[PDB]
Amino acid sequence: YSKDEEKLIQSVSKAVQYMAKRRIGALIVFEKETGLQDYIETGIAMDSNISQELLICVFIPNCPLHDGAMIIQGTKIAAAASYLPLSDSPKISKSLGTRHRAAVGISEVSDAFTVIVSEETGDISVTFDGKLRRDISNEIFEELLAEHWF
Amino acid sequence: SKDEEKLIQSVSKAVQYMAKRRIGALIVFEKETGLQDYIETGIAMDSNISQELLICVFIPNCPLHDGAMIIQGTKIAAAASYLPLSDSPKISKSLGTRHRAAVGISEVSDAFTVIVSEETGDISVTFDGKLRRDISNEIFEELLAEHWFG
């Protein structure tokens, strides 16, 4: 892995851990092969470089960009506050936030890789290919982020 | 010029919103004098400009609210940049440091800087070494257009 590719992962990883401990809900979608320009246009265009600080700033509660999904295209944030499709599978708990139903939702209609931070639990969750992995450790998140991103 | 009038509206509407809520803000737009020296002081963004993103950067306690946002052309080159503070004896000493930061970058370059006072909520501007205080919103858009797009 490139030195920069690792810098990005620690940036994203450090941001997720900050939000995890403070129970800040967060929802970040990483584009893979399926084009997500339909969903990127849902929100406010950023086309911005990544840094931990930006990631945290976007999800601050009572912030204009916290409501919705941040969508990442390659090494850039394509948009924030995107509306993703919500999922209807009856196997989602219903004790689970809209963010979670959105991430499995986008997981059903594309190959995208999405990380969710539960505003109520602080657990780190991941979705891809219609499948959900819940309450992963930081080590596993960095492991999985790298595979799907790079 | 249509694209410019929407950028001016983006910047102007955000500045007024922060003004009414007494949110401190400090934004410098570069013209002729390169600031890449100061842009490297802060967090690299290279981000498109939008009303929501300007406001999110300066929400109090946001990791980027402390410092200067620097704008290059139609993009935000960096946020939370360190500008040099000025030592002129006509400065109130009755004003937050944000004011003296804009008078600082005004002395060493031709840059155009806007300030929103955290304690007062008034709108100020600096260029060519002098500070102009509590201008109206109508006047602020006129000067921004003048200095940003010639």
Residue numbers in the entry:
A (entry chain A): 110 to 259
B (entry chain B): 111 to 260
Relevant lines from the article:
In the human pathogen Staphylococcus aureus, c-di-AMP is produced by the di-adenylate cyclase enzyme DacA, which is thought to form a complex and be regulated by YbbR and GlmM, two other conserved proteins. GlmM codes for the essential phosphoglucosamine mutase enzyme, required for the conversion of glucosamine-6-phosphate to the early peptidoglycan synthesis precursor glucosamine-1-phosphate. We determined the atomic structures of the S. aureus DacA and GlmM enzymes and show that GlmM readily binds to DacA in vitro and blocks its activity by masking its active site. Specifically, our data suggest that GlmM blocks access to the active site of DacA and in this manner prevents the formation of catalytically active head-to-head DacA oligomers.
Two key interacting residues in the dimer interface are amino acids N166 and T172. To potentially disrupt this interaction, we mutated these two residues to lysines, yielding variant DacACD-K. To “lock” the dimer conformation, we also mutated these residues to cysteines (DacACD-C variant) to facilitate the formation of disulfide bonds between the two protomers. To further assess if the DacACD-C variant could form disulfide-bridge locked dimers, the purified protein was crystallized and its structure determined. The protein crystallized in the same dimeric conformation as the DacACD protein and electron densities consistent with the formation of two disulfide bonds were observed for the DacACD-C variant, which were absent in the DacACD protein. The WT DacACD and DacACD-C variant had similar elution profiles and eluted at a retention volume as expected for a DacACD dimer. The DacACD-C variant displayed very similar activity to the WT DacACD protein, suggesting that locking the dimer through two disulfide bridges does not influence the activity of the enzyme. The melting curves for the DacACD and DacACD-C proteins were sigmoidal, which is typical for well-folded proteins. Taken together, these data show that WT DacACD and the ‘locked-dimer’ DacACD-C variant show similar enzymatic activities, suggesting that the stable dimer we observed in our crystal structures will likely transiently interact with other dimers to form higher oligomers for catalysis and c-di-AMP product formation.
